[PDB]
Amino acid sequence: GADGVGNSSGNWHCDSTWMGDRVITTSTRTWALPTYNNHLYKQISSQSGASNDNHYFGYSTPWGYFDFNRFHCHFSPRDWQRLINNNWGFRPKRLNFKLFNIQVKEVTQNDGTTTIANNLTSTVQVFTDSEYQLPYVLGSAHQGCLPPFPADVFMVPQYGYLTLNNGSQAVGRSSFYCLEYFPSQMLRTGNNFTFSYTFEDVPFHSSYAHSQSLDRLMNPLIDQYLYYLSRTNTPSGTTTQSRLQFSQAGASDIRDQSRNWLPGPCYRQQRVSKTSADNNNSEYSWTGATKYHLNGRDSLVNPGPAMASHKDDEEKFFPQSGVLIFGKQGSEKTNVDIEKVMITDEEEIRTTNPVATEQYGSVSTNLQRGNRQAATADVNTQGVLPGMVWQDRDVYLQGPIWAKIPHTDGHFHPSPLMGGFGLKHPPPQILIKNTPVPANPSTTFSAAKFASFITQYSTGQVSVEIEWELQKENSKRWNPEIQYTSNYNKSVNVDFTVDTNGVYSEPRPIGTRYLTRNL
Amino acid sequence: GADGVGNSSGNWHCDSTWMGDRVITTSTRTWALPTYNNHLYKQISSQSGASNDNHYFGYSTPWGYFDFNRFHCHFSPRDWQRLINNNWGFRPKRLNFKLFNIQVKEVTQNDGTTTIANNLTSTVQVFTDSEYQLPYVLGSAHQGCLPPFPADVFMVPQYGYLTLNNGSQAVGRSSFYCLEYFPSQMLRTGNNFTFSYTFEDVPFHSSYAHSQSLDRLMNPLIDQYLYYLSRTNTPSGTTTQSRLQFSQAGASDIRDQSRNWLPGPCYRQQRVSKTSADNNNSEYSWTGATKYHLNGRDSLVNPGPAMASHKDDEEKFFPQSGVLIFGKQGSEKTNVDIEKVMITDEEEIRTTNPVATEQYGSVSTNLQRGNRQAATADVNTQGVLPGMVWQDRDVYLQGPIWAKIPHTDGHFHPSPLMGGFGLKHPPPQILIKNTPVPANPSTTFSAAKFASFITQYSTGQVSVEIEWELQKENSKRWNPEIQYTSNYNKSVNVDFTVDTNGVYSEPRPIGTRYLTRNL
Amino acid sequence: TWALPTYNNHLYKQISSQSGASNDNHYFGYSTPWGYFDFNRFHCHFSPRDWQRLINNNWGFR
């Protein structure tokens, strides 16, 4: 840091600049940090009797952490539109981080009034691990983001983690991390903190949608030179006999043509409808779910593999867990009606990824003979096969930007299943805490742990700046594209704006896929 | 080679040196080489009536070969412990090979006595293919290793191979290799042989175990912002109606949370117990096995894909073939009791790879409607899907170090299924033979193949030195690790030591995974 | 992190054994307002895991 109590440690920077090829964004927010857990660590675990699936064991810490991982932190609704309408892809490159204008307040709750005053000599300490030595919590899509709207103020969320358990009990291999055991940087009023970071090379995210379905790749005018088996028998006299005929596949045969490629893999979902009348009356929620089984307990696959949500001309149906779901403004935690949630749509991927609610295809179950008749069965789960292409899941406007790839001997197509960018060395976790200030010890000496501290909290401003790389488009498409538009009719409230009471709200999910490409 | 009959061609080197980052090992053994097959090639094949699975066709040769491929050759039980306790991974780099102190003996069996004497002018010839032109036998985990204990003496195993067959009969494509048709190096007493080799780049083997299970990646304190479908219906009056409610997943919901990753693939096994009372009474061995079907015959998958052996708090069960199994000292070939075998345990991989005896998960089989009710089925086999992470199988103390990757147009995650390091250009096979010495031909000329030779054999010392690369650990774990310890109680015999009759024995399998890492 | 009280109301005092006591338990001395820092125990310096690249891996330390 630098200088005094009266001097300011940083300016407010929130802006976006568009350079053409690479583009830069900036934002600044205001935060407040409480003391958590009365300055002490605690182990936490599952509560008494619980399902074998719900057991957990871990620790909670006094430390907080910053999360900018959602897009809406970085991009405004309009800045989001020089991106998704005008471009075929984007990726991050490098970022900056800064804290400044730190001030610490102590509070006195005596009687029915609470007085608050500056504590000028108190400190707040911050570090960034950057060696990836801690359990990495970010990327699990928790709350506690920097707000989407720059004028809002937010608390910093508390930090904690989980470790191997057996039931509600720990195992010998289970690990315990003390955050005090790292070098950090102690800051007072008039001290600031910075670091900078560089993304590893990662593929552009695909903001295009395809103009060709994988099942139609070819010229309708010209027939193939390959033959397929067409008729298996022919009438002879009164009744048929076995005769094999072959054919070349034309535009009337398009079903039957040879191809060089296959659709992507599927792991199948249950289908439900937004119209309440079509759905069965029972509780199938947990029973009818698709799950995976790991170490004797069952977990839902909430996003699951990337698959189209519905087929043509059914907009009413979506996979049970297969989609992301966002809440509207002020929605509650539990048991809330469908009118409150916002359900995203995965469609444009129909052309490669198969629909999530249907089988991959059909396969032959048996060997035919004279007295046996051919039999097939549906394959509801398919792994990856050579010659198989697919697309990934869209990032939308608000959702995960990145995730940390687990450190393991093998992995396949690491792009993460919620969306965004898989990173082996992602942006490091930033951790922050209030330094404990003891209160009025006894006159005689005693060896005991202090239970008594001054009650205080801190606040300041944080800033983030990321540099993005863009991919422009050369398209010879003659006719116009599909663009993201706001409706021009009159309305009581404007979208993406404060209401009369001053609560900013986001009307609908906005994906990145509009501009079209050929497959 | 160099110099004389009286001069020695090499010193005994067996040692281990630890440099920190890289590390170097050395060993020397004493061998004896018989003449095989009376100096001639023979075709071999399956015997008369046999199962269609058991047919084979091939050749056996007079040549022998050296196999150091097991770890216990290179590492002593204590040297194995500055490795597995102190490190997160290791890989080979380069090796040396040497033969020396060669001496050839001829034997005379007349009457009831056998005299043995030096033959000073006889030769022994050796070559290393290194162009990978021969069938590559090593890596199939046969017998004939350099002994684990440096004072033992061993024969060199005989060399042979197999080729395409139809039943017990050869096919036109089947190949025949004459080892005489290579350049080799002929050695007498006072001649030595050397070559050196460099491993291609290969990933470190993972000697860590994970401190986090893949099903728990996230902060218990903070709720997600995503919604999952929670209740499918609500009571209305006397009976329920269809109503869809949604929820955000907290620490009580941990079963239901969204995740960016999925567990590794499985190919399922039958489960048996070490307690003899739980197992069914019948012969299910071959019938209840998991198999693959190639060209009309069936083969067991003995190791199979890497999967955890058992779940929490069942130590009694293991997959039917799914684990490696080692014999104790002096165990016989066939039909031996469980008390004689040593069964390895694959557990620490519970956190990623699914258990081998259970299904991967459940998937939805049908489309619901008003009068239809949701249906699911177990998926017992899963291929690789995008966003899937796993671990490989552990090497232990004694077992394959490497295998040769087959030469093919495609392969996936080549790490071999017994364990160790897949190599496209592995250490080349060393081949050795006694040169035939004819005996006393007839006085008149005859054109015929000699059936009569001097009876002789050779012996000497061999040496191997490998350089290893190590990966140290930076861990902020506060509490202690799990280490490999010998029990301190008194006992009749010390582990990994000679008994009163002088037979070295190994009490238990020792894996490499102790130190812990975060996932 | 430490906290330092004022001891003895900013003044020195002589202290000694209390009245009747065993001849073994008699003592005479002084107490001061001053405090002092003690790091002399190992567990201050070494964590349980750091203690294990030491005692398992080594024949001595100073």
mmCIF file of C-alpha atoms in Angstrom, chain A residues 188-319:
data_model
loop_
_atom_site.group_PDB
_atom_site.id
_atom_site.type_symbol
_atom_site.label_atom_id
_atom_site.label_comp_id
_atom_site.label_asym_id
_atom_site.label_seq_id
_atom_site.Cartn_x
_atom_site.Cartn_y
_atom_site.Cartn_z
ATOM 1 C CA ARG A 188 -4.622 -1.216 7.275
ATOM 2 C CA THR A 189 -6.401 1.913 6.146
ATOM 3 C CA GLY A 190 -4.296 3.274 3.327
ATOM 4 C CA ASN A 191 -2.889 -0.051 2.136
ATOM 5 C CA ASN A 192 -3.856 -1.793 -1.089
ATOM 6 C CA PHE A 193 -3.504 -5.248 -2.622
ATOM 7 C CA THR A 194 -3.000 -6.369 -6.231
ATOM 8 C CA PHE A 195 -2.101 -9.356 -8.341
ATOM 9 C CA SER A 196 -2.323 -10.315 -12.004
ATOM 10 C CA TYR A 197 -2.968 -13.615 -13.763
ATOM 11 C CA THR A 198 -2.642 -15.165 -17.226
ATOM 12 C CA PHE A 199 -5.021 -17.777 -18.626
ATOM 13 C CA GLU A 200 -3.524 -20.867 -20.180
ATOM 14 C CA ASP A 201 -4.406 -21.460 -23.806
ATOM 15 C CA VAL A 202 -7.989 -22.697 -24.167
ATOM 16 C CA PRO A 203 -10.247 -23.130 -27.227
ATOM 17 C CA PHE A 204 -12.710 -20.415 -28.132
ATOM 18 C CA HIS A 205 -16.246 -20.986 -26.980
ATOM 19 C CA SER A 206 -18.538 -21.636 -29.920
ATOM 20 C CA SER A 207 -21.191 -18.934 -30.194
ATOM 21 C CA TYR A 208 -22.367 -20.123 -33.620
ATOM 22 C CA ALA A 209 -25.277 -22.427 -34.363
ATOM 23 C CA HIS A 210 -25.146 -24.856 -37.270
ATOM 24 C CA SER A 211 -26.952 -24.321 -40.567
ATOM 25 C CA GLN A 212 -26.767 -28.025 -41.477
ATOM 26 C CA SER A 213 -27.933 -31.070 -39.578
ATOM 27 C CA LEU A 214 -25.507 -33.970 -39.413
ATOM 28 C CA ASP A 215 -28.058 -36.277 -40.979
ATOM 29 C CA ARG A 216 -28.108 -34.121 -44.148
ATOM 30 C CA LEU A 217 -24.552 -33.453 -45.407
ATOM 31 C CA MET A 218 -24.931 -34.052 -49.100
ATOM 32 C CA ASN A 219 -26.091 -33.055 -52.552
ATOM 33 C CA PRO A 220 -29.748 -33.936 -53.208
ATOM 34 C CA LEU A 221 -29.240 -33.828 -56.964
ATOM 35 C CA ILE A 222 -26.701 -36.629 -57.363
ATOM 36 C CA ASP A 223 -27.029 -40.290 -56.419
ATOM 37 C CA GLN A 224 -24.386 -42.203 -54.505
ATOM 38 C CA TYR A 225 -22.348 -44.976 -56.056
ATOM 39 C CA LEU A 226 -22.672 -47.183 -52.951
ATOM 40 C CA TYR A 227 -25.406 -49.825 -52.550
ATOM 41 C CA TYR A 228 -27.529 -50.616 -49.495
ATOM 42 C CA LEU A 229 -29.708 -53.661 -48.926
ATOM 43 C CA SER A 230 -33.246 -52.552 -49.766
ATOM 44 C CA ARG A 231 -35.725 -55.418 -50.204
ATOM 45 C CA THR A 232 -35.244 -58.686 -48.345
ATOM 46 C CA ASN A 233 -37.808 -60.811 -50.186
ATOM 47 C CA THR A 234 -39.856 -60.977 -53.346
ATOM 48 C CA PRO A 235 -43.293 -62.390 -54.168
ATOM 49 C CA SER A 236 -43.063 -65.665 -56.077
ATOM 50 C CA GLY A 237 -46.404 -67.039 -57.171
ATOM 51 C CA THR A 238 -48.838 -66.890 -54.275
ATOM 52 C CA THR A 239 -46.306 -66.235 -51.502
ATOM 53 C CA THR A 240 -42.961 -64.507 -51.084
ATOM 54 C CA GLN A 241 -39.516 -66.097 -51.072
ATOM 55 C CA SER A 242 -36.153 -64.855 -49.847
ATOM 56 C CA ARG A 243 -34.360 -62.731 -52.439
ATOM 57 C CA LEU A 244 -31.861 -59.961 -51.711
ATOM 58 C CA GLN A 245 -32.059 -56.762 -53.752
ATOM 59 C CA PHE A 246 -29.795 -53.734 -53.549
ATOM 60 C CA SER A 247 -30.154 -50.081 -54.443
ATOM 61 C CA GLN A 248 -28.315 -46.792 -54.789
ATOM 62 C CA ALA A 249 -29.548 -44.039 -52.487
ATOM 63 C CA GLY A 250 -30.985 -40.877 -54.013
ATOM 64 C CA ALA A 251 -32.991 -37.901 -52.790
ATOM 65 C CA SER A 252 -36.009 -40.124 -52.198
ATOM 66 C CA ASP A 253 -33.795 -42.518 -50.189
ATOM 67 C CA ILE A 254 -32.102 -39.863 -48.022
ATOM 68 C CA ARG A 255 -32.921 -41.962 -44.959
ATOM 69 C CA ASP A 256 -30.724 -44.779 -46.279
ATOM 70 C CA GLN A 257 -27.520 -43.032 -47.383
ATOM 71 C CA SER A 258 -23.973 -43.759 -46.255
ATOM 72 C CA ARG A 259 -22.261 -41.222 -44.041
ATOM 73 C CA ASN A 260 -18.826 -40.566 -42.590
ATOM 74 C CA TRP A 261 -20.008 -39.465 -39.156
ATOM 75 C CA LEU A 262 -22.214 -40.258 -36.141
ATOM 76 C CA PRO A 263 -23.979 -38.164 -33.485
ATOM 77 C CA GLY A 264 -22.576 -37.510 -30.039
ATOM 78 C CA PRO A 265 -23.062 -39.642 -26.922
ATOM 79 C CA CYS A 266 -26.123 -39.619 -24.689
ATOM 80 C CA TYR A 267 -27.004 -40.522 -21.106
ATOM 81 C CA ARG A 268 -30.758 -40.515 -21.069
ATOM 82 C CA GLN A 269 -33.167 -38.299 -19.090
ATOM 83 C CA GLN A 270 -36.797 -38.392 -18.007
ATOM 84 C CA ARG A 271 -39.134 -35.992 -19.819
ATOM 85 C CA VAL A 272 -41.602 -33.584 -18.204
ATOM 86 C CA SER A 273 -43.890 -30.890 -19.582
ATOM 87 C CA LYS A 274 -44.525 -27.300 -18.591
ATOM 88 C CA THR A 275 -48.247 -27.930 -19.010
ATOM 89 C CA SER A 276 -49.284 -29.485 -15.713
ATOM 90 C CA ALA A 277 -51.945 -31.745 -17.233
ATOM 91 C CA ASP A 278 -49.601 -34.048 -19.169
ATOM 92 C CA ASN A 279 -47.436 -35.006 -16.198
ATOM 93 C CA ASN A 280 -48.144 -38.142 -14.198
ATOM 94 C CA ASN A 281 -49.645 -37.866 -10.716
ATOM 95 C CA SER A 282 -47.172 -39.425 -8.247
ATOM 96 C CA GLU A 283 -43.787 -38.526 -6.827
ATOM 97 C CA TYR A 284 -41.223 -39.662 -9.409
ATOM 98 C CA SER A 285 -38.742 -36.871 -8.658
ATOM 99 C CA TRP A 286 -35.998 -38.888 -6.980
ATOM 100 C CA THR A 287 -37.165 -42.301 -8.199
ATOM 101 C CA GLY A 288 -37.451 -41.409 -11.883
ATOM 102 C CA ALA A 289 -34.144 -39.521 -11.893
ATOM 103 C CA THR A 290 -30.991 -40.427 -13.788
ATOM 104 C CA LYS A 291 -28.131 -41.023 -11.365
ATOM 105 C CA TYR A 292 -24.585 -42.263 -10.949
ATOM 106 C CA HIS A 293 -23.430 -44.614 -8.220
ATOM 107 C CA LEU A 294 -20.136 -43.916 -6.443
ATOM 108 C CA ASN A 295 -18.982 -45.665 -3.268
ATOM 109 C CA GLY A 296 -22.369 -46.980 -2.245
ATOM 110 C CA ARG A 297 -24.246 -43.676 -2.473
ATOM 111 C CA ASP A 298 -26.294 -42.215 -5.323
ATOM 112 C CA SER A 299 -26.005 -38.746 -6.854
ATOM 113 C CA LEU A 300 -28.214 -37.033 -9.392
ATOM 114 C CA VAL A 301 -26.481 -35.815 -12.541
ATOM 115 C CA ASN A 302 -27.909 -32.374 -12.591
ATOM 116 C CA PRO A 303 -26.594 -30.908 -15.873
ATOM 117 C CA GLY A 304 -25.527 -34.273 -17.244
ATOM 118 C CA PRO A 305 -23.963 -34.642 -20.676
ATOM 119 C CA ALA A 306 -24.812 -32.021 -23.262
ATOM 120 C CA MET A 307 -27.910 -32.988 -25.236
ATOM 121 C CA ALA A 308 -30.688 -31.129 -27.001
ATOM 122 C CA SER A 309 -33.672 -30.373 -24.803
ATOM 123 C CA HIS A 310 -36.540 -31.073 -27.226
ATOM 124 C CA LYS A 311 -37.243 -32.080 -30.820
ATOM 125 C CA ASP A 312 -38.959 -30.033 -33.529
ATOM 126 C CA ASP A 313 -42.317 -28.471 -32.634
ATOM 127 C CA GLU A 314 -42.370 -29.641 -29.044
ATOM 128 C CA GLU A 315 -41.488 -26.629 -26.908
ATOM 129 C CA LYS A 316 -43.461 -27.965 -23.962
ATOM 130 C CA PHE A 317 -40.996 -30.618 -22.828
ATOM 131 C CA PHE A 318 -37.596 -30.488 -21.152
ATOM 132 C CA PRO A 319 -35.306 -33.046 -19.497
#
